[PDB]
Design a protein around this ligand. Structure first.
Ligand SMILES: [Cl-]
Ligand SMILES: [Cl-]
Ligand SMILES: [Zn+2]
Ligand SMILES: [Zn+2]
Ligand SMILES: [Zn+2]
Ligand SMILES: [Zn+2]
Ligand SMILES: [Zn+2]
Ligand SMILES: [Zn+2]
Ligand SMILES: [Zn+2]
Ligand SMILES: [Zn+2]
Length: 241
């Protein structure tokens, strides 16, 4: 990643390059049957977003769906609480008490007595946390609030410089806005975390978006970076000086 080349924490890589055939199908149902809340019999056109199961390291994988104005509308009004323990891979470090040697999340689930769990997150300068629970499929687009729809992202991966035009927010808002201005239009949307080796944090998220009216047709690479810090992609957190 280059702060010079890409100050907004993304790089436009090319066209959407999607296989629309592989996507979960659009269907017609009701707000009630879909959202599982309220008695809203309002008919809605939606798709069921495909989320990836975690891999063997506990890492989140790609998610993809067809985003509709109705999905946006239902997420605009309603919010779902975080499902229990949504923190994705690399969010914590684990260490064997006996050795002070690094352990894995698995080791911790296996024997919490002999393995400590410590947050990798830290506060940094206005003053807040450096890493976010960073959605793959945004809440505003119908995303589910659970681990599998998250990666451990830098605040800048998530929202860039937070001027509505950076990080995941860039491509999210562009899709959100275009559907909102063209309510009959739907967008094929896919967010794919890119990992190197067994690293628990993704280096980037690849987001591909193809609108049904052809207006939006791109893939952006959103960098899991933040200016002035060196992230430890292997274990999460920052490199130790
Ligand atoms: Cl595809
Ligand atoms: Cl830098
Ligand atoms: Zn670029
Ligand atoms: Zn599948
Ligand atoms: Zn929602
Ligand atoms: Zn839910
Ligand atoms: Zn986000
Ligand atoms: Zn547009
Ligand atoms: Zn279509
Ligand atoms: Zn040192």
């Amino acid at each position: 990643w280059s702060i010079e080349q890409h100050p907004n924490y993304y790089h436009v890589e090319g066209k959407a390059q999607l296989d629309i055939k592989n996507f979960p199908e659009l269907y017609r149902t009701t707000e009630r049957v879909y959202k599982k809340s309220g008695q809203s019999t309002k008919p809605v056109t939606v798709s069921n977003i495909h989320y990836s199961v975690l891999d063997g390291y506990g890492r989140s994988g790609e998610a993809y769906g067809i985003i509709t104005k109705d999905m946006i509308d239902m997420s605009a009004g309603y919010r779902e609480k975080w499902e229990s323990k949504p923190e994705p891979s690399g969010w914590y470090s684990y260490f064997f008490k006996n050795t002070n040697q690094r352990a894995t999340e698995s080791d911790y689930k296996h024997s919490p007595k002999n393995v400590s769990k410590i947050s990798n997150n830290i506060k940094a300068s206005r003053n807040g946390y450096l890493f976010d629970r960073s959605g793959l499929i945004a809440d505003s687009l119908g995303g589910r609030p659970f681990r599998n729809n998250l990666i451990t992202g830098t605040r800048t991966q998530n929202v860039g410089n937070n001027d509505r035009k950076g990080g995941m927010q860039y491509i999210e808002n562009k899709v959100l806005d275009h559907i909102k201005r063209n309510p009959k239009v739907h967008v094929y949307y896919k967010a794919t975390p890119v990992y190197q080796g067994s690293e628990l944090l993704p280096r980037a998220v690849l987001v591909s978006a193809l609108s049904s009216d052809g207006f939006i047709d791109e893939t952006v690479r959103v960098f899991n970076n933040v200016a002035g810090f060196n992230i430890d992609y292997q274990n999460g957190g920052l490199l130790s000086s």
